[PDB]
Nanobody, 120 residues
Framework: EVQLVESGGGLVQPGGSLRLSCAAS????????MAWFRQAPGKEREFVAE???????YYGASVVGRFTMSRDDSKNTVYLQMNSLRAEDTAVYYC??????????????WGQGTLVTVSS
């Protein structure tokens, strides 16, 4: 079955940086959109970033200019580079995958997440 596996979570101080990665298999990676979402304690899941093999990449309003996402289609891996981290970036971060022929909010596959804590 499809696997999406996040790596890289942990504790970072405010102002620090952290890079997450997500390894994908079991579906046609090159044609899907890959995305990062996050869920802060007790809140609804929030869009973070999305990237297509065409190069098109875009971000949530709260993170644009601080986070960057990249994809390595040759290695079935995506990355989230998080800079200038803030306490309110604390969340479980999830990788997700979306078919090119699905509605723009329909994500078929979800990783199990990685915890990121930003605290002094």
């Amino acid at each position: 079955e499809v696997q999406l596996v996040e790596s890289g979570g942990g504790l970072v101080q405010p102002g620090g940086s952290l890079r997450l990665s997500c390894a994908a298999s079991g579906f046609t990676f090159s044609t899907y959109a890959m995305a990062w979402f996050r869920q802060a304690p007790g809140k609804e899941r929030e869009f973070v970033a999305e990237s297509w093999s065409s190069g098109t990449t875009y971000y949530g309003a709260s993170v644009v200019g601080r986070f960057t996402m990249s994809r390595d289609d040759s290695k079935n891996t995506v990355y989230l580079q998080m800079n200038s981290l803030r306490a309110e970036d604390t969340a479980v971060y999830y990788c997700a995958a979306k078919r090119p022929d699905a509605g723009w909010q329909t994500y078929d596959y979800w990783g199990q997440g990685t915890l990121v804590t930003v605290s002094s």
